[PDB]
Amino acid sequence: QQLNEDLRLHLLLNTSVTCNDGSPAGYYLKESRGSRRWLLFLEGGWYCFNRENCDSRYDTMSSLMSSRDWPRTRTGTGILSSQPEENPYWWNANMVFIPYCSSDVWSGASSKSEKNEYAFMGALIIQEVVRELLGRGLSGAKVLLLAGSSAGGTGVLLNVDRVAEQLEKLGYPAIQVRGLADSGWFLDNKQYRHTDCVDTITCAPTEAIRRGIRYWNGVVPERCRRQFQEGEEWNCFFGYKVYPTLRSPVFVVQWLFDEAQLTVDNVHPVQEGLRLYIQNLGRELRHTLKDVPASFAPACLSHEIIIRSHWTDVQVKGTSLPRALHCWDRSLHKGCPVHLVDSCPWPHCNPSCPT
Amino acid sequence: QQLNEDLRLHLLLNTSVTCNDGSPAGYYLKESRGSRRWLLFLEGGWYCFNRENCDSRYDTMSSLMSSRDWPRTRTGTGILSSQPEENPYWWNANMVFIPYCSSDVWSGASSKSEKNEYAFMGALIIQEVVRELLGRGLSGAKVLLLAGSSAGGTGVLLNVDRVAEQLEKLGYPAIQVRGLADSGWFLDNKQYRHTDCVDTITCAPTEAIRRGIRYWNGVVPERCRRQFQEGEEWNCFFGYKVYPTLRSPVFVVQWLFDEAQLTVDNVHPVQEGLRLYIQNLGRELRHTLKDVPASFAPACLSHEIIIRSHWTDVQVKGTSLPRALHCWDRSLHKGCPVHLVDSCPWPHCNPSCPT
Amino acid sequence: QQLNEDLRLHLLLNTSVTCNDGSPAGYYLKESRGSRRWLLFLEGGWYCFNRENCDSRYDTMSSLMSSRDWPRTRTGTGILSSQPEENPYWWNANMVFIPYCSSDVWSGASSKSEKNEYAFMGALIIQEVVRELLGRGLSGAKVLLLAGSSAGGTGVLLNVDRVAEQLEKLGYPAIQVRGLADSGWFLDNKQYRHTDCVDTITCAPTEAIRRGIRYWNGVVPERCRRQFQEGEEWNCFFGYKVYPTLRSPVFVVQWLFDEAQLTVDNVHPVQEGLRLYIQNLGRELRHTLKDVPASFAPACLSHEIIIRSHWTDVQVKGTSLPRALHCWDRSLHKGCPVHLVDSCPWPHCNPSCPT
Numbered sequence A, B, C: 001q002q003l004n005e006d007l008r009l010h011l012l013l014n015t016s017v018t019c020n021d022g023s024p025a026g027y028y029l030k031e032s033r034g035s036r037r038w039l040l041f042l043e044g045g046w047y048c049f050n051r052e053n054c055d056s057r058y059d060t061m062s063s064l065m066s067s068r069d070w071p072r073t074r075t076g077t078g079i080l081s082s083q084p085e086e087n088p089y090w091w092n093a094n095m096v097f098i099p100y101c102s103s104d105v106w107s108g109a110s111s112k113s114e115k116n117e118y119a120f121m122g123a124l125i126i127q128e129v130v131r132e133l134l135g136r137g138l139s140g141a142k143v144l145l146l147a148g149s150s151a152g153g154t155g156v157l158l159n160v161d162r163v164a165e166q167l168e169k170l171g172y173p174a175i176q177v178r179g180l181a182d183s184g185w186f187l188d189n190k191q192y193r194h195t196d197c198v199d200t201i202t203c204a205p206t207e208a209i210r211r212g213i214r215y216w217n218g219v220v221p222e223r224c225r226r227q228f229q230e231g232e233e234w235n236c237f238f239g240y241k242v243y244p245t246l247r248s249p250v251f252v253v254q255w256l257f258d259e260a261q262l263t264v265d266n267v268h269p270v271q272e273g274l275r276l277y278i279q280n281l282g283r284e285l286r287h288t289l290k291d292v293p294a295s296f297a298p299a300c301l302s303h304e305i306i307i308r309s310h311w312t313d314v315q316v317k318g319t320s321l322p323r324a325l326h327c328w329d330r331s332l333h334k335g336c337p338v339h340l341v342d343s344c345p346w347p348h349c350n351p352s353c354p355t
């Protein structure tokens, strides 16, 4: 009933490319054969940077490490919705949802693993999903928007140029690859209270990635890798460091007080030392988006937005995000602004912040 | 009680000028002797382009073909309201409502008819109502805003210059005649599903007018008539064709997905051929307003607005219609915009669309 | 409980400086030792310009003539709130509330009075409160924002430069003194119905001040005093007259149809002579703010706003007042407008007007 309007699950045909637990990876697809725009969405949901933490994620959140519980179909929401009230400009696009089952911020390029231990093939899964879509209409595309939330937004920053190069190398160069990074723009800042790196939610962002990369056998974009010392690839997971060497255009959406950012910075009236910290965090962030011409950053304490149903409720300086994305579409073809950043300095100082 | 604040019915003194059924025509009036602005509103409500269709409209909707049921008074609403919460800039104007009883899009100029058959004197009724108002304060006016909705909005396009010339010819040339056309801006486009021209609601806009004009003995503005072949006066009912030869300033208000337009185009998730059609219709429309400097066009599926009570709820690009009308007032005496057209491509992609 | 977050009452140490009834004056204080901004708020609430009217205010409203009922603490609200949802940019400032107990529009400079009669030391109370705050962190300040509502807003206009000079003269010249005047911008216009000057709420603004000044032994700013004849100091209570000689920057917030203004103009559908009057009043007002570059003036019938909790609900031309105040902060260090004045000509023609 609703099934007839849904994205449909396809497992990958190459079974060498798997989820963490060796089960095959895949993608949900809904084609629109009146449209030439393509929306590839990278799911997020943290990561695991060593074996005991993954074993723990498997007990607790195996849905993020395995395809054994993926349903046959799913309903598109937010920018994947076909409903024009919820998705004003993109409701007619070809919709693709790639589930996150690699726990590696879509950086994994390990061809093999050993048996009884996890595989990390994030970056390969994207590569293979792109391959298969070429056989299903992607070949005829104008715009391929690689989008993602949280770990998936960071994944966009890591993979957008690799996809752009994958397609150029395959002789589809009418296709414009673009990126849209939601809640994946983080700071490698000092924690409010420094704590030891043990759990996924206590580990300072720098240390987490530094360990993750070597565990996942992760890859970062070459232009960025070459700007930092060898063994310092972790820098390339931080948006403000990787952004400038990107060749593809990328729109950056980012709550100035991201729940994930506050969690790794170990933040939980309010103490005066903490007042300072939270406040100076929104400022560091605001700072890093000055050179990012296309962005949306409200003064809210939240997490993810682009596939949430209420993504149209939030406004910055009179403007909604779908509208900002549209203006950005137009800037790649003046009353139509694409740089929207809240000046007010505390979460929920903006009143359109979602609960 | 409410009667003391209402517009009052006046039947025309010249009984040669009648409604469809031979009963006298007229106008509702409420004067404001602190104001020098005048608001003449032309009611709409379709038309009938042959004898069997009119006979059918008489059985069903004789209120639109006769004054026998007109009440003594009526309450002004929207831009005819005296309530400043509902009518921010025009609440103090002289208010005039001319009921539509000619079924001829205010184009009828038939001096006589035969007995037992309908008269079509739309354009004369306007002329006579203007005459009479000269004896009641119109003589002292600065601005005469001829306004109308639906068939009445089209009537504005057909009659605004004739009124302007009527007054010049009568030696009242301090009076600025302006127009305001609501839901009267139509396209002469192909139907989604072509159907035969039989009922008022199935007949393609082109064919309906082509027949109506010859039945009503209709008149179009001379400047427009002369731009098209003889026997092609019907073109002059289409706003984008008649607009450029208008001498009077005209503000154009128009839902991009007008219910009336969808009805004559014979439109009723959604089929893919229909997706295309509705979408390309909002685009054709948007297109035709590019050269119309003063306009308001939301991405809504609706019908009429200027005398509806909730006319202030709808916004385009942060701006309400009364505000847009004000800015337009100012442009005839820069933070104050008068060209407001929704870019989003589907009805109710704008969230301020009324139900 | 709430007490721990509140402003705390301090009575003045110099007991020569009193409220009307000889009881000591004072101020509520809440310091924020992460902030260098200071917010001094002057309460309002009319005045009494002769002995029988004061005796009457003492029976009825002794809270405004005495400190005997002042509570130990009070909760900051609006621009004095520490809650960032209610106070987006200023929630972290040092907060000061000076209660109005002098009945003299903060103009009183009578060192002494006789016994059994009232003292009017408004201007001295401000001077003494500023003195004491120097011993508590004001010394280290960047910005001192003198703010007030109603009689307190007028008091800001009367005292902002005196404070600026008090501090310069005391050798604290890193401190930028600014003003924020809320509902204290009045017209010295003709009453709608002229009535005799007897009660505080019937007395034309001109006559009230003319009498008050000589009774309170009031002082006006020197630059303004010198622009008018001797014995015409009352002019200097009217914002549009005093504003141009101000040296300190002042932001002016003012409902175009202020309840207090309507009360002294003796205003209570609506009569045609009264329609004219109210309308031409909003226009005179609008007029007087043309040269005031930094202002906020909605088309509402209201009174006071800056410490009311809903101060963020009202918008003018898409912009809230806290936002306008912020832009103004920025202009003293282009998408950020500070001149916001409703063009619509009747109270509640703006829909964001508070009830």
Ligand SMILES: *[C@@H]1O[C@H](CO)[C@@H](O)[C@H](O)[C@H]1NC(C)=O
Pocket (backbone or CB within 6 Å): A014, A016, A017, A111, A124
């Ligand atoms: C998976 O299989 C396809 C088709 O044989 C191939 O082109 C692709 O590169 C393969 N990937 C790996 C890791 O073997």
Ligand SMILES: *[C@@H]1O[C@H](CO)[C@@H](O)[C@H](O)[C@H]1NC(C)=O
Pocket (backbone or CB within 6 Å): B014, B016, B017, B111, B124
């Ligand atoms: C109707 O009567 C008036 C007054 O005699 C006249 O001026 C007007 O032109 C007449 N119209 C017709 C159609 O006879």
Ligand SMILES: *[C@@H]1O[C@H](CO)[C@@H](O)[C@H](O)[C@H]1NC(C)=O
Pocket (backbone or CB within 6 Å): C014, C016, C017, C111, C124
């Ligand atoms: C009040 O006392 C203080 C401290 O002695 C003094 O500096 C101030 O000027 C006094 N004011 C009056 C009116 O005596």
